[PDB]
C-alpha cells in the first residue's frame, strides 16, 4: 500500500483532518504528488504493527509521547532540519520530539493545563494556591466553592506537586533516567501535602471526578477549575462567563503541568522521505498549512512561532502556550505507565487518609522504578498490585493465580485468575503468620495443577515478600537467612518490616 | 442506602430531610468510607438546627474521622460559634486532636475567632498544647498576623 511518488497521512478522527487534506491537495497542484489523509480507528497501534512489516502510511500525527517507543522499534526516520528551519518552532516542542539523542518527528501543536474561572463569581482569580482556602471560605458563606478539578488522575493534580520540586524521571542529556525518579522528595511532599490539607478541611472533596468537576464549574457552582482545550467547547455551550489563565503558583514557583506536543514523524518504512521533508517542511509547518488545519478544527497552541504569536491573540490559547512553558514535556518512555499508576494510587491513598503523604509518595517512589513481576520460583511471582491490573502482562508470564497480600486492593479478574486474598496491613500489629498456612497451602494447590502464582502487595517489598519467604522456608526446609538471601538475590529491594521479620523467624522454629 | 442521603441532608442543609430520613431508619452515626458522619458535615456546613437534631437522636460528639477531625475541629476551623458552643454542651472534648496534633483551638487561632477562643478557653483549651510543628495556638495566631488574639493568647 506504500508506493513511491505518494503520501498517505494518518492523523487521529478528532483532529482537522479535512483541513490536513487541502494542505495536501495544494501540495498536489504544486508538484504531481498526490496527498491521501486517512484518520483510522486505533492508528496508534495498527501503525507499530504494519509498519514492522514495512508498510503503514508515510507520515503519521500523534502526541509525541507515543513516539519514543516507536522510535525505540526503529520505525520512525531521522529527521535534520536545517538551523533556519528548526529556528522557527520553540526550541522546547523540539525537546519532546527526541529519542536517544536524534530527532524523530516534527513539532505541531502545544497542549497543556489551565486555570478556567468564572468571571461572575470571581473577578479576582488567585495567583497562588496558598489563596484558595481563605477564598473558599468566603465563596462557601453564599452557597458556592472556590475550585473543583478531577482529583481522581494524577494528570491533573501533577501540576501541583511538582511545582516545588517533583518530576518523574530524571532527564539529563537526551535521556530520561528510569532509576532517577523525582515524586518523593521534598517538593513532591510539600505539594501533595498542600492538597491533602484541602481535602481534610473541605476545601475540596476526594471524590471528586472529571464529570462532577466540569458540571459544577459548566452550572455555576464553583468559581474555578482546572482543565484543558478539549473542555472549552462545553463552557461556551453552558455560556458561563469565563476566563483561561495561569495556573496558581505554589511557595512562588509556577505550577508545572506536562505538555503534550502534537507530532508527525516519518514511517522509516517510507519511500518517499524526501517529499515527506518537502510537504511538512515547505507546505505543512506555515502559517497557511497550520491555518487550514486550525481553521477545520482547533489545534490549540501551536509550536511554529509566527502562527503562535497570531493565534495567541485568543487569551485562552495565549493561557495555554504561558503554562505549557512553565509546564515539562511528557517523558516520551514506556516506564511512564508504571509511573501514572503509582502517583495515582499515592494520591488516592493520601486523599483518603489510608496512607500518610510521606507513606504514600514512599511507595510511588518504587513503583514508578520497578520492573515487571519478578520470577521467584518457576510457578512462584513476587510483585505489586500494579502488575495484577495488567491481565496481558501477567498472561505473558503463564500466571494462573493471584495472592493479594493487602486490605484493600481488589481482584481484578475474578473470571481469570484464581485468588487468594490476605488482608493485612504493613504495620507492627499486623499477625501475617498467621496466614502462612493458608497461603502455602493455595500455592501448592495452584502448583499442583501446573498453575502459577503472582503474589503482590502495594510496592512488592514487604507484605508479598514475606509469603513467598514463607513459602520457601516450609517447603525447601530452609532458614529464614537462606530463604531471604535468596530472594534478595532477585529482587534487593524486599524488606519485610522487622516485625514480619520477627514472625517468619518464629516461623522458622516452627517448620 | 440511607445513611449516604443523611450525610448529603446534613451537608446540604436539609432539615427536613434529615428528620424525615432518620424516622425511616437512616443511621445517625452513618459514615463514609473516611469516617465522616452527619455530624460533621453539618458542623462544617454551619447548619446548627441539623446539629442539635443529630445529637438529640444521638450521634456521637466526639466521632473523629480518617484525619482525627471531631465536629468541634470542623466548626472551629469554619468559624461556627453556636455550634461549638452546642457541640461543647454535648460533651465535646476541647482538647481533642487530630493527626497533626492539633487542637479546636490551633484552627480557631488560625482564622483568628476571637469569640470561639474565648469560648474554647472558658471550657479548659490547654493553651500550652503544641501540634506537630512544634507550634502553640499562640504561635500560630502570631504566624497568621492575628494581633488582637495574640495579645489574648500571650498567658
Given at each position: 500500500?506504500?508506493?513511491?511518488?505518494?503520501?498517505?497521512?494518518?492523523?487521529?478522527?478528532?483532529?482537522?483532518?479535512?483541513?490536513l487534506?487541502?494542505?495536501?491537495?495544494?501540495?498536489?497542484?504544486?508538484?504531481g504528488?498526490?496527498?491521501?489523509?486517512?484518520?483510522?480507528?486505533?492508528?496508534?497501534?495498527?501503525?507499530?504493527?504494519?509498519?514492522?512489516?514495512?508498510?503503514?502510511?508515510?507520515i503519521?500525527?500523534?502526541?509525541?509521547?507515543?513516539?519514543?517507543?516507536?522510535?525505540?522499534?526503529?520505525?520512525?526516520?531521522?529527521?535534520?532540519?536545517?538551523?533556519?528551519?528548526?529556528?522557527?518552532?520553540?526550541?522546547?516542542?523540539?525537546?519532546?520530539?527526541?529519542?536517544?539523542?536524534?530527532?524523530?518527528?516534527?513539532?505541531?501543536?502545544?497542549?497543556?493545563?489551565?486555570?478556567?474561572?468564572?468571571?461572575?463569581?470571581?473577578?479576582?482569580?488567585?495567583?497562588?494556591?496558598?489563596?484558595?482556602?481563605?477564598?473558599?471560605?468566603?465563596?462557601?458563606?453564599?452557597?458556592k466553592?472556590?475550585?473543583?478539578?478531577?482529583?481522581?488522575?494524577?494528570?491533573?493534580?501533577?501540576?501541583?506537586?511538582?511545582?516545588?520540586?517533583?518530576?518523574?524521571?530524571?532527564?539529563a542529556?537526551?535521556?530520561?533516567?528510569?532509576?532517577?525518579?523525582?515524586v518523593?522528595?521534598?517538593?513532591?511532599?510539600?505539594?501533595?501535602?498542600?492538597?491533602?490539607?484541602?481535602?481534610?478541611?473541605?476545601?475540596?472533596?476526594?471524590?471528586?471526578?472529571?464529570?462532577?468537576?466540569?458540571?459544577?464549574?459548566?452550572?455555576?457552582?464553583?468559581?474555578?477549575?482546572?482543565?484543558?482545550?478539549?473542555?472549552?467547547?462545553?463552557?461556551?455551550?453552558?455560556?458561563?462567563?469565563?476566563?483561561?489563565?495561569?495556573?496558581?503558583?505554589?511557595?512562588?514557583?509556577?505550577?508545572?503541568?506536562?505538555?503534550?506536543?502534537?507530532?508527525?514523524?516519518?514511517?522509516?518504512?517510507?519511500?518517499?522521505?524526501?517529499?515527506?521533508?518537502?510537504?511538512?517542511?515547505?507546505?505543512?509547518?506555515?502559517?497557511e498549512?497550520?491555518?487550514?488545519?486550525?481553521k477545520?478544527?482547533?489545534?490549540?497552541?501551536?509550536?511554529?512561532?509566527?502562527?503562535?504569536?497570531?493565534?495567541?491573540?485568543?487569551?485562552?490559547?495565549?493561557?495555554?502556550?504561558?503554562?505549557?512553558?512553565?509546564?515539562?514535556?511528557?517523558?516520551?518512555?514506556p516506564?511512564?505507565?508504571?509511573?501514572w499508576?503509582?502517583?495515582?494510587?499515592?494520591?488516592?491513598?493520601?486523599?483518603?487518609?489510608?496512607?500518610?503523604?510521606?507513606?504514600?509518595?514512599?511507595?510511588?517512589?518504587?513503583?514508578?522504578?520497578?520492573?515487571?513481576?519478578?520470577?521467584?520460583?518457576?510457578?512462584?511471582?513476587?510483585?505489586?498490585?500494579?502488575?495484577?491490573?495488567?491481565?496481558?502482562?501477567?498472561?505473558?508470564?503463564?500466571?494462573?493465580?493471584?495472592?493479594?497480600?493487602?486490605?484493600?486492593?481488589?481482584?481484578?479478574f475474578?473470571?481469570?485468575?484464581?485468588?487468594?486474598?490476605?488482608?493485612?496491613?504493613?504495620?507492627?500489629?499486623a499477625?501475617?503468620?498467621?496466614?502462612?498456612?493458608?497461603?502455602?497451602?493455595?500455592?501448592?494447590?495452584?502448583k499442583?495443577?501446573?498453575?502459577?502464582?503472582?503474589?503482590?502487595?502495594?510496592?512488592?517489598?514487604?507484605?508479598?515478600?514475606?509469603?513467598?519467604?514463607?513459602?520457601?522456608?516450609?517447603?525447601?526446609?530452609?532458614?529464614?537467612?537462606?530463604?531471604?538471601?535468596?530472594?534478595?538475590?532477585?529482587?534487593?529491594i524486599?524488606?519485610?518490616?522487622?516485625?514480619?521479620?520477627?514472625?517468619?523467624?518464629?516461623?522458622?522454629?516452627?517448620? | 442506602?440511607?445513611?449516604?442521603?443523611?450525610?448529603?441532608?446534613?451537608?446540604?442543609?436539609?432539615?427536613?430531610?434529615?428528620?424525615?430520613?432518620?424516622?425511616?431508619?437512616?443511621?445517625?452515626?452513618?459514615?463514609?468510607?473516611?469516617?465522616?458522619?452527619?455530624?460533621?458535615?453539618?458542623?462544617?456546613?454551619?447548619?446548627?438546627?441539623?446539629?442539635?437534631?443529630?445529637?438529640?437522636?444521638?450521634?456521637?460528639?466526639?466521632?473523629?474521622?480518617?484525619?482525627?477531625?471531631?465536629?468541634?475541629?470542623?466548626?472551629?476551623?469554619?468559624?461556627?460559634?453556636?455550634?461549638?458552643?452546642?457541640?461543647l454542651?454535648?460533651?465535646?472534648?476541647?482538647?481533642?486532636?487530630?493527626?497533626?496534633?492539633?487542637?479546636?483551638?490551633?484552627?480557631?487561632?488560625?482564622?483568628?475567632?476571637?469569640?470561639?477562643?474565648?469560648?474554647?478557653?472558658?471550657?479548659?483549651?490547654?493553651?500550652?498544647?503544641?501540634?506537630?510543628?512544634?507550634?502553640?495556638?499562640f504561635?500560630?495566631?502570631?504566624?497568621?498576623?492575628?494581633?488582637?488574639?495574640?495579645?489574648?493568647?500571650?498567658?
Amino acid at each position: 500500500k506504500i508506493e513511491e511518488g505518494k503520501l498517505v497521512i494518518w492523523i487521529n478522527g478528532d483532529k482537522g483532518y479535512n483541513g490536513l487534506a487541502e494542505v495536501g491537495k495544494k501540495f498536489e497542484k504544486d508538484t504531481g504528488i498526490k496527498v491521501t489523509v486517512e484518520h483510522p480507528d486505533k492508528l496508534e497501534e495498527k501503525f507499530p504493527q504494519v509498519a514492522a512489516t514495512g508498510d503503514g502510511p508515510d507520515i503519521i500525527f500523534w502526541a509525541h509521547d507515543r513516539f519514543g517507543g516507536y522510535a525505540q522499534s526503529g520505525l520512525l526516520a531521522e529527521i535534520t532540519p536545517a538551523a533556519a528551519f528548526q529556528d522557527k518552532l520553540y526550541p522546547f516542542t523540539w525537546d519532546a520530539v527526541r529519542y536517544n539523542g536524534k530527532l524523530i518527528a516534527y513539532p505541531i501543536a502545544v497542549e497543556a493545563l489551565s486555570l478556567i474561572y468564572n468571571k461572575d463569581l470571581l473577578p479576582n482569580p488567585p495567583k497562588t494556591w496558598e489563596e484558595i482556602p481563605a477564598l473558599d471560605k468566603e465563596l462557601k458563606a453564599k452557597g458556592k466553592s472556590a475550585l473543583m478539578f478531577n482529583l481522581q488522575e494524577p494528570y491533573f493534580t501533577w501540576p501541583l506537586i511538582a511545582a516545588d520540586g517533583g518530576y518523574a524521571f530524571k532527564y539529563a542529556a537526551g535521556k530520561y533516567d528510569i532509576k532517577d525518579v523525582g515524586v518523593d522528595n521534598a517538593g513532591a511532599k510539600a505539594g501533595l501535602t498542600f492538597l491533602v490539607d484541602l481535602i481534610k478541611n473541605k476545601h475540596m472533596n476526594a471524590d471528586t471526578d472529571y464529570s462532577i468537576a466540569e458540571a459544577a464549574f459548566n452550572k455555576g457552582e464553583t468559581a474555578m477549575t482546572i482543565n484543558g482545550p478539549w473542555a472549552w467547547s462545553n463552557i461556551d455551550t453552558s455560556a458561563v462567563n469565563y476566563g483561561v489563565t495561569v495556573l496558581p503558583t505554589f511557595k512562588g514557583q509556577p505550577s508545572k503541568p506536562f505538555v503534550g506536543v502534537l507530532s508527525a514523524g516519518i514511517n522509516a518504512a517510507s519511500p518517499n522521505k524526501e517529499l515527506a521533508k518537502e510537504f511538512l517542511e515547505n507546505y505543512l509547518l506555515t502559517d497557511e498549512g497550520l491555518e487550514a488545519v486550525n481553521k477545520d478544527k482547533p489545534l490549540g497552541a501551536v509550536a511554529l512561532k509566527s502562527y503562535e504569536e497570531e493565534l495567541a491573540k485568543d487569551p485562552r490559547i495565549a493561557a495555554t502556550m504561558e503554562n505549557a512553558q512553565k509546564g515539562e514535556i511528557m517523558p516520551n518512555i514506556p516506564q511512564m505507565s508504571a509511573f501514572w499508576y503509582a502517583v495515582r494510587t499515592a494520591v488516592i491513598n493520601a486523599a483518603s487518609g489510608r496512607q500518610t503523604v510521606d507513606a504514600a509518595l514512599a511507595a510511588a517512589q518504587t513503583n514508578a522504578a520497578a520492573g515487571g513481576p519478578v520470577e521467584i520460583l518457576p510457578f512462584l511471582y513476587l510483585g505489586s498490585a500494579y502488575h495484577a491490573s495488567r491481565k496481558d502482562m501477567l498472561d505473558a508470564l503463564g500466571i494462573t493465580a493471584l495472592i493479594n497480600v493487602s486490605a484493600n486492593c481488589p481482584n481484578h479478574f475474578e473470571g481469570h485468575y484464581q485468588y487468594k486474598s490476605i488482608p493485612v496491613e504493613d504495620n507492627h500489629k499486623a499477625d501475617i503468620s498467621s496466614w502462612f498456612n493458608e497461603a502455602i497451602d493455595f500455592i501448592d494447590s495452584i502448583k499442583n495443577a501446573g498453575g502459577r502464582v503472582f503474589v503482590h502487595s502495594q510496592a512488592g517489598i514487604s507484605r508479598s515478600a514475606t509469603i513467598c519467604l514463607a513459602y520457601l522456608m516450609r517447603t525447601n526446609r530452609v532458614k529464614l537467612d537462606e530463604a531471604f538471601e535468596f530472594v534478595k538475590q532477585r529482587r534487593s529491594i524486599i524488606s519485610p518490616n522487622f516485625s514480619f521479620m520477627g514472625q517468619l523467624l518464629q516461623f522458622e522454629s516452627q517448620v | 442506602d440511607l445513611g449516604r442521603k443523611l450525610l448529603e441532608a446534613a451537608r446540604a442543609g436539609q432539615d427536613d430531610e434529615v428528620r424525615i430520613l432518620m424516622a425511616n431508619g437512616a443511621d445517625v452515626n452513618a459514615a463514609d468510607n473516611t469516617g465522616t458522619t452527619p455530624l460533621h458535615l453539618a458542623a462544617y456546613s454551619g447548619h446548627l438546627e441539623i446539629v442539635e437534631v443529630l445529637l438529640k437522636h444521638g450521634a456521637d460528639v466526639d466521632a473523629s474521622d480518617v484525619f482525627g477531625y471531631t465536629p468541634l475541629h470542623l466548626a472551629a476551623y469554619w468559624g461556627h460559634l453556636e455550634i461549638v458552643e452546642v457541640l461543647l454542651k454535648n460533651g465535646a472534648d476541647v482538647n481533642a486532636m487530630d493527626s497533626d496534633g492539633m487542637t479546636p483551638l490551633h484552627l480557631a487561632a488560625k482564622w483568628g475567632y476571637l469569640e470561639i477562643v474565648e469560648v474554647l478557653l472558658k471550657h479548659g483549651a490547654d493553651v500550652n498544647a503544641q501540634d506537630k510543628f512544634g507550634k502553640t495556638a499562640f504561635d500560630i495566631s502570631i504566624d497568621n498576623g492575628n494581633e488582637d488574639l495574640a495579645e489574648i493568647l500571650q498567658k
